[PDB]
């Protein structure tokens, strides 16, 4: 699976003669292969079917998730926890259940988090399966001189294959004889343009020559013959499919950010452990205790719910998106749009509507503009002159297409029309502002029509005149404006007629160049009243000789047409450029059309200029001008084929408005790679199959949904179910938003680690009884903290997020040291002081003063010392002192909740004040209320001091943590004040997350 040999541009043999090609493959042009030779080649090369990818079972991925994230740090502990049980059961000591209910709780945490990480794990694309559904089941092959329909898989290289309008090309063929055959190279070019396949050769590029039919296409009309040159994994869209299924997915930014966050966390956990080991050796503890202490500190620094919390956080935004018809297959992708700095878009079908629409019209020496928007929300074109009526008669009569039966329900533009795109566009415009064409057509009976000719270059027909006062004959004709201009001598001005003097002939030339320069295709319409005296109502004008005056006609006016852009395309492109996002057009379309749509949508701002434009404005050769004076550049695919790596880097490094035209799919992949190379995230928005290799290697794919295909839909990460381009703007707002929110929730969940680890550090150092218990740390981490932190995600913006430039990937991170300095350094420290304060209060009120607590652990823990003297001389049994220690765990946990109130409030806003933003978030309020109700419930419910070991508190204790909370609030409030008044100062480069 050599990827480089698949990135190279394809090669072929269309230059050889028919006979020569047969020598290269071994066949008969009039008899084909023999059943013996055909089967022999069937055993030699293999079947004509795209093969399937290697598949990954699911017990594999779920298990992978088990030994991942920091679940490894938790395994060392669940397993260690059991080891101690085995030792107790085999050494015969305690039948109690502490160790075990912990190995079971830790194991359960790992199993549940695994489920949460799976829900987020990239889904497994079925690129090849969709692709495989492409090839039809039975082809028509001519063997031994007879026609037979055989399984397409049984087609080999060399035999004769016949195709008919409506069938799919079973393999890569070399046309030998055609009869008006046309193919739809949508899958390779990206255009529904009907190309024609002729046995003769016409271009050095195999993709442009007509003597080659391509797999993955269909013969729209006509019949043809040919020879099989490529079958299987060797075909063109076959090389593209094989490249698509074998192009890595990448690693999203949210993931890389999670990697960095994990790294940071594990760093401080191993630092604190190595430090308390050297300390435990300087004080005296044995090696068994020093090693056990190390393991305890590391595991204690792991936050059980921050990974699952990030999953819930991302899911709520994906639902908000689902409300605006924006569905994301990958949850991680949701964020990629906000971090994108360069959007590579497709034109036909994505930037436009892929529906030829009448754009501009010429009549009465005046250019008129028509509404070319989906929902018809614009300006009419003044339907009050007689000229327009005559124009409607010309176009509506000299047109053979008709709406498809049963469209009486859909609107006028989205209905199906059988015919060319020009006659269809004209029919739709006339049916739009002139009523039903079916009655307009039956109101005037067509007598004789002479079809479009390759020599005449026009289309004409005569019909009766519905004037009940004029029984004469009407003649109408349409065609290229130059040919029709050479056939007129009058002009229908404002209704009356006038001669064709050079004044209006020059006005017609300037109008032709005006509509032509607009990237539009123009046509000319003229008509004439046949004199009923020289051609009576009974005379039949058989289409044989000159029965109609070719010249001396009456020209009425020109009519242009082009594929317009979707409604919110210009506004969305402008919004993206406003946010500092570089827009680049990439399409396999003609550079004239591509450039016109670029200037019309905002890619090439009006005023910027290309090197050819400067050479034309000055009238000098192009090799003289300097390329640095040109901001925008149009790069052609043929030229793109011959360019080095550095040249592409310079093209993107010096030109701000770029457009790649006539580019194949492999080149699309190359351009995306040229972007990522420097160091930016890329988003590709497409519709057809040639966007598949560009959507796979990009960082995020956006597929349309209504106007797309199944390959682009399955190979994308985000789907736009209504083809509303504006969803891209919404996604760039929400991405940044959901980015700024993860920081707040992370700081919130990282602040409570300190008041959770410090008690054990004091237990081993200062030799005081144990302040905080294991069953309390677990109830906090998975209970109280979750709801307030999941609610932080719903927070609104502070400033206009659509104004700042895209974040930098190498420097701006998600978790930086500025956060650690706040959670681990300033807020968590105060929380620890409040907890220890409530602790000392509980022990001082019951008889154990602070001076007598230092140095007691050895006797405070012993299970056989039933006489422990306190500061007043009383004698406490073992269970009696243990009850007080547990009541201290309960009040410590309640102190944590009290300080989390002020932490959730100071974490609500990173910069702004609370009196500005406001407490409009109902989930946060509910979080505080529930957080308090749960603590009261865990302490006061009967049977809790039996099950969980939490005793009731006396009402005076609940107020020992209040001052610390107010202080936290005031400190952070003054913190978020100097940042506002002083931008760029010490407080900013030291505490601004």
């Amino acid at each position: 699976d050599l990827d480089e040999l698949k990135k190279e541009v394809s090669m072929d043999d269309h230059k050889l003669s028919l006979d020569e090609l047969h020598n290269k493959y071994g066949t008969d042009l009039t008899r084909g292969l023999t059943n013996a030779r055909a089967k022999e080649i069937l055993a030699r090369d293999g079947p004509n079917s795209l093969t399937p990818p290697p598949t990954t079972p699911e017990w594999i991925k779920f298990c992978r998730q088990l030994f991942g994230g920091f679940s490894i740090l938790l395994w060392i502990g669940a397993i260690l926890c059991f080891l101690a049980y085995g030792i107790q059961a085999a050494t015969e000591d305690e039948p109690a259940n502490d160790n075990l209910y912990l190995g079971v709780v830790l194991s359960t945490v790992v199993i549940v988090t695994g489920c949460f990480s799976y829900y987020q794990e990239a889904k497994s694309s079925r690129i090849m399966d969709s692709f495989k559904n492409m090839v039809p089941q039975q082809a028509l092959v001519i063997r031994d001189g007879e026609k037979s329909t055989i399984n397409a898989e049984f087609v080999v290289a060399g035999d004769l294959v016949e195709v008919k309008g409506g069938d799919r090309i079973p393999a890569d063929l070399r046309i030998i004889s055609a009869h008006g055959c046309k193919v739809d190279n949508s899958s390779l070019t990206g255009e529904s343009e009907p190309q024609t396949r002729s046995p003769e050769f016409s271009s050095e590029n195999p993709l442009e020559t007509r003597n080659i039919a391509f797999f993955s296409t269909n013969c729209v009309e006509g019949t043809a013959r040919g020879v099989v040159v490529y079958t299987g994994d060797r075909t063109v869209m076959g090389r593209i499919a094989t490249l698509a299924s074998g192009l890595e997915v990448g690693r999203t930014p949210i993931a890389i950010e999670i990697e960095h966050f994990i790294h940071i966390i594990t760093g401080v956990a191993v630092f604190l452990g190595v430090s308390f080991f050297i300390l435990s050796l300087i004080l005296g503890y044995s090696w068994l205790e020093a090693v056990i202490f190390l393991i305890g500190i590391i595991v204690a620094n792991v936050p059980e719910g921050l990974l699952a919390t990030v999953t819930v956080c991302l899911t709520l935004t994906a639902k908000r998106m689902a409300r605006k018809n924006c569905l994301v297959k990958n949850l991680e992708a949701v964020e990629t749009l906000g971090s994108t700095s360069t959007i590579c878009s497709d034109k036909t079908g994505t930037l436009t509507q892929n529906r030829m629409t009448v754009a501009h019209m010429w009549f009465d020496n005046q250019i008129h503009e028509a509404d070319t928007t989906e929902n018809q929300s614009g300006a009419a074109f003044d339907k009050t002159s007689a000229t327009w009526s005559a124009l409607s008669r010309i176009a509506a009569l000299c047109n053979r297409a008709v709406f498809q039966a049963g469209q009486d329900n859909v609107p006028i533009l989205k209905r199906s029309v059988a015919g060319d795109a020009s006659e269809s566009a004209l029919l739709k415009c006339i049916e739009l502002c002139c009523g039903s064409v079916q009655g307009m057509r039956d109101r005037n009976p067509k007598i004789v029509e002479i079809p479009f000719n390759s020599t005449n270059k026009y289309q004409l027909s005569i019909h009766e005149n519905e004037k009940s006062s004029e029984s004469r004959y009407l003649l109408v004709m349409k065609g290229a404006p130059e040919r029709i201009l050479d056939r007129c001598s009058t002009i229908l001005l404002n209704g009356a007629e006038e001669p064709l003097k050079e004044d209006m002939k020059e006005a017609f030339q300037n109008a032709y160049l005006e509509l032509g320069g607009l990237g539009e295709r123009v046509l000319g319409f003229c008509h004439f009243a046949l004199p009923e005296d020289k051609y009576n109502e009974g005379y039949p004008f058989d289409a044989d000789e000159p029965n109609f005056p070719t010249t001396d006609l009456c020209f009425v006016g020109l009519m242009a047409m082009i594929d317009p852009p979707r409604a919110a395309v210009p506004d969305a492109v402008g919004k993206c450029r406003s946010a500092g996002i570089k827009v680049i057009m990439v399409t396999g379309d003609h550079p004239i059309t591509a450039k016109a749509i670029a200037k019309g949508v905002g890619i090439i701002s009006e005023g910027n200029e290309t090197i050819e434009d400067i050479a034309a404005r000055l009238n000098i050769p192009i090799g003289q001008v300097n390329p640095r004076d040109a901001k925008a550049c149009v790069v052609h695919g043929s030229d793109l084929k011959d360019l080095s790596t550095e040249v592409l880097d310079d093209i993107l490094h010096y030109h701000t408005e770029i457009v790649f035209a006539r580019t194949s799919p492999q080149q699309k992949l190359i351009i995306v790679e040229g972007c990522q190379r420097q160091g930016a995230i890329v988003a590709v928005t497409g519709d057809g199959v040639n966007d598949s290799p560009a959507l796979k290697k990009a960082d995020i794919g956006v597929a349309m949904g209504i106007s797309g295909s199944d390959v682009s839909k399955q190979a994308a990460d985000m789907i736009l179910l209504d083809d509303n381009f504006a969803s891209i703007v919404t996604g760039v707002e929400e991405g940044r938003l959901i980015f700024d929110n993860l920081k707040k929730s992370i700081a919130y969940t990282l602040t409570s680690n300190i008041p959770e680890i410090t008690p054990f550090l004091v237990f081993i150092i200062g030799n005081v009884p144990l302040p905080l218990g294991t069953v309390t740390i677990l109830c906090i981490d998975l209970g109280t903290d979750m709801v307030p932190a999941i609610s932080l995600a719903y927070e609104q913006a502070e400033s206009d997020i659509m104004k700042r430039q895209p974040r930098n990937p190498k420097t701006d991170k998600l978790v930086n040291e500025r956060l650690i300095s706040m959670a681990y350094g300033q807020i968590g420290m105060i929380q620890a002081l409040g907890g220890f304060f409530s602790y000392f209060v509980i022990l001082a009120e019951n008889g154990f003063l602070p001076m007598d607590l230092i140095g007691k652990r050895v006797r405070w823990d012993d299970r056989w010392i039933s006489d422990v003297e306190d500061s007043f001389g009383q004698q406490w049994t073992y269970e009696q002192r243990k009850i007080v220690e547990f009541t201290c765990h309960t009040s410590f946990f309640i102190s944590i909740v009290v300080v989390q109130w002020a932490d959730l409030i100071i974490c609500k806003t990173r910069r702004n004040s609370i009196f500005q933003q406001g407490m409009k978030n109902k989930i946060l309020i509910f979080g505080l209320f529930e957080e308090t109700a749960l603590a009261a419930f865990l302490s006061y419910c009967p049977g809790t001091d039996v099950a969980l070991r939490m005793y009731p508190l006396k009402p005076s204790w609940w107020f020992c943590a209040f001052p610390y909370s107010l202080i936290i609030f005031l400190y952070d409030e003054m913190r978020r004040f100097i940042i506002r008044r002083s931008p760029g100062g010490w407080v900013e480069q030291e505490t601004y997350y």
Binding site: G825, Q826, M829, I830, L833, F836, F837, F840, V841, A844, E845, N846, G847, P850, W864, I865, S866, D867, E869, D870, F872, G873, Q874, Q875, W876, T877, Y878, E879, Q880, I883, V884, P963, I967, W986, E990
Partner: protein, 294 residues
């Protein structure tokens, strides 16, 4: 990377910052942590002002009182061989540590040990819990009162020939008045004989019905010859108001103990403000496992 992020010589940076940054950050954390320490200390001083020196504010976690014992047995088991002397050393060292506080040399002079009734008597109130009349006075408790377990005659206290002693003690509680059961028709079997209102009775027995036969003669030694605690040593006024205070003790000799067999002996005190707990096996009663294997 490796080398640069450690020391570059153009910006004169170490680990990432310059000389003045480490100073700004160190000074900030010094001032911050200093304020933190001062605030914690102030909030602890107001706490020293809240509480009283002669009485714990809350006395609900220590009631009723426990019942501890010497020796110091781990897992509540007293197992020793009558031949190997290095088997009951850990026990004697404890027993001795406890009795070493009742030496007559310590109890001398008028203060603060006054001579009290040689026979059980009633309570004695030395006033309130104040500093007005200085250090209160506590009754003297002589060693010799315990007859065969005093370490004065047979230092070992009995462990030498298969006859051990167990000095039981009631947990000291401030302002706690012991209340014995009255002579009414409802009273345990044992307590009927020798009802001395002024004595809190202590009586040991066998946990299981079978072990009864295997346990011999429980001989209690105490004040006045009774198997209890004299009410005159109460109440206790606390360390601050009654330093040099001695709590009564009761010796128990388990004579005629079957050899080479684990015996479960449960001792229990009786009284009104005495209540046992199924969770705390030392509240009012206590359990001992004795096995004189020889």
């Amino acid at each position: 990377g490796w080398k640069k992020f450690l020391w570059d010589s153009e910006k004169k940076e170490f680990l990432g910052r310059t000389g003045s940054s480490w100073f700004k950050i160190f000074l900030f954390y010094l001032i911050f942590y200093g304020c933190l320490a001062g605030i914690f200390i102030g909030t602890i001083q107001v706490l020293l002002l809240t509480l009283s020196d002669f009485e714990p504010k809350y006395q609900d976690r220590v009631a009723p009182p426990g019942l501890s014992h010497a020796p110091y047995a781990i897992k509540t088991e007293i197992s020793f061989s009558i031949s190997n002397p290095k088997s009951y050393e850990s026990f004697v060292k404890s027993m001795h540590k406890l009795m070493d506080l009742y030496n007559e040399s310590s109890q001398a002079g008028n203060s603060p040990f006054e001579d009290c009734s040689d026979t059980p008597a009633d309570y004695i109130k030395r006033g309130d819990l104040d500093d007005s009349q200085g250090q209160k006075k506590a009754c003297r408790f002589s060693r010799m009162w315990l007859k065969n377990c005093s370490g004065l005659d047979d230092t070992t206290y009995g462990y030498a020939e298969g006859k051990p002693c167990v000095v039981a003690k009631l947990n000291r509680i401030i302002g706690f008045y012991p209340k014995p059961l009255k002579n009414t028709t409802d009273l345990p079997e044992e307590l009927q004989a020798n009802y001395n209102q002024y004595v809190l009775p202590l009586r040991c027995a066998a946990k299981r019905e079978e072990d009864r036969e295997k346990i011999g003669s429980i001989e209690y030694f105490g004040l006045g010859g009774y198997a209890g605690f004299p009410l005159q040593y109460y109440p206790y006024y606390g360390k601050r108001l009654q330093k040099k205070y001695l709590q009564p003790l009761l010796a128990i000799q388990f004579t005629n103990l079957t050899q080479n067999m684990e015996l479960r002996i449960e001792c229990k005190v009786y009284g009104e403000n005495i209540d046992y707990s199924e969770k705390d096996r030392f509240r009012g009663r206590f359990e001992v496992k004795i096995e004189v294997k020889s």
